[PDB]
Design an enzyme around this catalytic site. Sequence first.
Site, PDB file in Angstrom:
ATOM      1  N   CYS A 140      -1.648   6.157  -1.980  1.00 44.01           N
ATOM      2  CA  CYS A 140      -1.804   6.103  -0.482  1.00 44.01           C
ATOM      3  C   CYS A 140      -2.769   7.121   0.302  1.00 44.01           C
ATOM      4  O   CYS A 140      -3.572   6.559   1.190  1.00 44.01           O
ATOM      5  CB  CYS A 140      -0.452   5.647   0.132  1.00 44.01           C
TER       6      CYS A 140
ATOM      7  N   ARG B 259       0.343  11.534  15.097  1.00 46.50           N
ATOM      8  CA  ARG B 259       1.634  11.178  14.226  1.00 46.50           C
ATOM      9  C   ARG B 259       2.478  10.386  15.125  1.00 46.50           C
ATOM     10  O   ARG B 259       2.593  10.154  16.313  1.00 46.50           O
ATOM     11  CB  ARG B 259       2.083  12.382  14.208  1.00 46.50           C
TER      12      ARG B 259
ATOM     13  N   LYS C 219       0.904  -1.357   0.035  1.00 44.15           N
ATOM     14  CA  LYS C 219       0.147  -0.174   0.032  1.00 44.15           C
ATOM     15  C   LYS C 219       0.740   1.213  -0.014  1.00 44.15           C
ATOM     16  O   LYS C 219       0.425   2.333  -0.350  1.00 44.15           O
ATOM     17  CB  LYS C 219      -0.825   0.084   0.928  1.00 44.15           C
ATOM     18  N   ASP C 220       2.059   1.110   0.357  1.00 38.42           N
ATOM     19  CA  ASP C 220       3.004   2.405   0.435  1.00 38.42           C
ATOM     20  C   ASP C 220       3.571   2.602  -1.091  1.00 38.42           C
ATOM     21  O   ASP C 220       4.439   3.525  -1.409  1.00 38.42           O
ATOM     22  CB  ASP C 220       4.233   2.288   1.314  1.00 38.42           C
TER      23      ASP C 220
ATOM     24  N   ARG D  69      -8.732   7.764   4.792  1.00 38.14           N
ATOM     25  CA  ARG D  69      -9.537   6.729   4.229  1.00 38.14           C
ATOM     26  C   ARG D  69     -10.296   6.030   5.678  1.00 38.14           C
ATOM     27  O   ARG D  69     -11.409   5.922   5.797  1.00 38.14           O
ATOM     28  CB  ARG D  69      -8.754   5.609   3.997  1.00 38.14           C
ATOM     29  N   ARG D  70      -9.402   5.906   6.569  1.00 42.11           N
ATOM     30  CA  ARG D  70      -9.928   5.417   8.101  1.00 42.11           C
ATOM     31  C   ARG D  70     -10.786   6.468   8.589  1.00 42.11           C
ATOM     32  O   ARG D  70     -12.053   6.129   8.996  1.00 42.11           O
ATOM     33  CB  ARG D  70      -8.877   5.159   8.984  1.00 42.11           C
TER      34      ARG D  70
ATOM     35  N   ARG E 126       2.587   5.912  18.847  1.00 46.87           N
ATOM     36  CA  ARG E 126       1.404   6.243  19.076  1.00 46.87           C
ATOM     37  C   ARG E 126       0.835   5.434  20.093  1.00 46.87           C
ATOM     38  O   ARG E 126       0.035   5.600  20.954  1.00 46.87           O
ATOM     39  CB  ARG E 126       0.559   5.463  17.665  1.00 46.87           C
TER      40      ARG E 126
HETATM   41  C1  LIG Z   1      -0.704   4.401   2.081  1.00 45.95           C
HETATM   42  C2  LIG Z   1      -0.474   4.389   4.015  1.00 45.95           C
HETATM   43  N1  LIG Z   1       0.320   3.792   4.585  1.00 45.95           N
HETATM   44  C3  LIG Z   1       0.252   3.913   5.817  1.00 45.95           C
HETATM   45  C4  LIG Z   1       1.309   3.605   6.925  1.00 45.95           C
HETATM   46  C5  LIG Z   1       1.474   2.135   6.781  1.00 45.95           C
HETATM   47  N2  LIG Z   1       2.006   1.349   5.907  1.00 45.95           N
HETATM   48  C6  LIG Z   1       1.991   0.027   5.921  1.00 45.95           C
HETATM   49  C7  LIG Z   1       1.458  -0.129   7.170  1.00 45.95           C
HETATM   50  C8  LIG Z   1       1.459  -1.671   7.980  1.00 45.95           C
HETATM   51  C9  LIG Z   1       0.207  -2.309   7.335  1.00 45.95           C
HETATM   52  C10 LIG Z   1       0.445  -3.016   5.824  1.00 45.95           C
HETATM   53  O1  LIG Z   1       1.773  -3.118   5.708  1.00 45.95           O
HETATM   54  O2  LIG Z   1      -0.420  -2.961   5.101  1.00 45.95           O
HETATM   55  C11 LIG Z   1       1.242   1.270   7.777  1.00 45.95           C
HETATM   56  C12 LIG Z   1       0.471   1.312   9.060  1.00 45.95           C
HETATM   57  C13 LIG Z   1      -0.861   1.049   9.449  1.00 45.95           C
HETATM   58  O3  LIG Z   1      -1.801   1.245   8.368  1.00 45.95           O
HETATM   59  O4  LIG Z   1      -1.204   0.922  10.342  1.00 45.95           O
HETATM   60  C14 LIG Z   1      -1.092   4.513   6.015  1.00 45.95           C
HETATM   61  C15 LIG Z   1      -1.884   4.727   7.428  1.00 45.95           C
HETATM   62  C16 LIG Z   1      -1.262   5.999   7.844  1.00 45.95           C
HETATM   63  C17 LIG Z   1      -1.959   6.089   9.401  1.00 45.95           C
HETATM   64  O5  LIG Z   1      -1.969   7.314   9.876  1.00 45.95           O
HETATM   65  O6  LIG Z   1      -2.343   5.076  10.058  1.00 45.95           O
HETATM   66  C18 LIG Z   1      -1.622   4.693   4.684  1.00 45.95           C
HETATM   67  C19 LIG Z   1      -3.038   5.258   4.351  1.00 45.95           C
HETATM   68  C20 LIG Z   1      -4.223   4.279   4.645  1.00 45.95           C
HETATM   69  O7  LIG Z   1      -3.973   3.110   5.058  1.00 45.95           O
HETATM   70  O8  LIG Z   1      -5.534   4.719   4.550  1.00 45.95           O
END
Ligand SMILES: *Cc1[nH]c(Cc2[nH]cc(CCC(=O)O)c2CC(=O)O)c(CCC(=O)O)c1CC(=O)O
Length: 318
Positions: A225, A131, A62-63, A113-114, A137
């Site tokens: 993302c 943050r 997702k990154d 999104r969340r 967190r």
């Molecule tokens: C696009 C996006 N990245 C993140 C941060 C992130 N990337 C991976 C993870 C772990 C889960 C995985 O590997 O799929 C995470 C952290 C997490 O989702 O808990 C986010 C979330 C940012 C935040 O403030 O939680 C996002 C955006 C999204 O998921 O909507």
Amino acid sequence: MRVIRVGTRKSQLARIQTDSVVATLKASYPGLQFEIIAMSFTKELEHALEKNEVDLVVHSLKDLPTVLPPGFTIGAICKRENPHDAVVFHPKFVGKTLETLPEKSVVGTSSLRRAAQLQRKFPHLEFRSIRGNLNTRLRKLDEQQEFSAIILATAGLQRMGWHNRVGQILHPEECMYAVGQGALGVEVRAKDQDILDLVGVLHDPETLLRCIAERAFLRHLEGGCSVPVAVHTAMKDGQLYLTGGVWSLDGSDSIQETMQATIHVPAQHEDGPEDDPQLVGITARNIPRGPQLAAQNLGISLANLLLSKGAKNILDVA
Ligand SMILES: *Cc1[nH]c(Cc2[nH]cc(CCC(=O)O)c2CC(=O)O)c(CCC(=O)O)c1CC(=O)O
């Protein structure tokens, strides 16, 4: 092929994800040597790839953007871990759910999104930015009285061995997950045939087809993302099901639709043509191309249906 150099970020979760992929590789390749090269954000790792300083890098899918720079590609989509969103509760609220927190409780999340989806579902809660990495967190949760809960991916806490902090796992009807959530992508040089072949063993056909659809949906909506776009995929009965949604920033306006397409999961690897281009940034030449194209087309199809109902105006300001 002698020493396979795996580049990783120095963050804790990035290292765990890298180690997991290296362990899986070693199990297929007990006779090869693997080196983990930790460097002091994606452009710096892509730099090492381009300078042949490492041979592959591991990401949360997702990154990764839906368009990668032309010299790189996703050579492996690993078997998806748990894709769902989760809630960690403040210590005084252990055992509660979002539904039973007191009104005006502040819930910490920096994902549009969340926040958009949960605001819609839980009008009486407040959603506020938070943050930091997972440890930070969780510290702000336990040390202060500002937040009553935080939202995090189930997969991140599982990789940390902190599943005991999960107080609630959110269903799609409450919060659908991000495109690619729970899957790991392996980025490699697009023209390095030996390494593409090596990592290809990690491709999980089901996860690959689910993630091509999810990413093609996102790409055709011109998202990344950062946007309030969410999905749900499942492969059952020879069908691929894709649900997709867009939300305004406060969740009050939304579009959510489902489509399906007959797509059988490939059970066998095949020697595919080397001259076929990547699909939404993924190269899987050892997996039949038919189902891959069909998954991409399903995601484009759903994206066009959402755009027909006005998703572009929703996303433009969100
Ligand atoms: C696009 C996006 N990245 C993140 C941060 C992130 N990337 C991976 C993870 C772990 C889960 C995985 O590997 O799929 C995470 C952290 C997490 O989702 O808990 C986010 C979330 C940012 C935040 O403030 O939680 C996002 C955006 C999204 O998921 O909507």
